[PDB]
Design a protein around this ligand. Sequence first.
Ligand SMILES: [Cl-]
Lengths: 170, 84
Amino acid sequence: STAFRKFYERGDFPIALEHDSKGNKIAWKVEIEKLDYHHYLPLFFDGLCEMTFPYEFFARQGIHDMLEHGGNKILPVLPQLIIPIKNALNLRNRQVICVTLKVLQHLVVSAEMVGKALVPYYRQILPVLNIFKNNIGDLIQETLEAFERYGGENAFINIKYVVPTYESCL
Amino acid sequence: DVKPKSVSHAKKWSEEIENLYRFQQAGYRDETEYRQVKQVSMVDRWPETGYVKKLQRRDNTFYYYNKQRECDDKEVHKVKIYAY
Ligand SMILES: [Cl-]
């Protein structure tokens, strides 16, 4: 939020603040594989709250590229992402929720064991979804099924504990 | 409950190795174990180099580290590199 905006204007923001006429790709000043994800990834997740142009564009594109190319750099940082995820979701803004759920789907397929590691944090991040359970209702179901799919044997029941109405036939 | 699976020994000194050195001197595998054990906002680092500046140990004493490289080429081999 304010944290991300400060980040955005600093020389150490790793993305070049420029637009190419060819398309909407972001240009990295610094190679992604060279970033300490312990520092940078939570800063980008702070941007989930962002709804203002151009902050939200760089937050979203940045998260996406770092998740896509993070490899084994992502899982070690998972605990640091939970509070920014929770904070975004608990705003109870549908647009922010829809971006955050798509991000979460990317997160749990981004690397091995990440879906499994998310399970102990279900109770921190799922509760607001009950308000918007059934468009956002379908996105929620879809997201919960991703969590189950890549979350190991203990995933269904922990989803169900937090989201009592959850059902699934994978 | 996030913990590495495989372990290798470092080959050539690098920035990454320097920092692993500093964590392990203080009794931590890496920044992930450090943040598990202690409640950490950010890690104190040297602005110019990004090197770890200070760490709190498990007995609550503190280790401080120099602005420039500390890992002697001799010591490089002893730095453990953890998997995931
Ligand atoms: Cl994404």
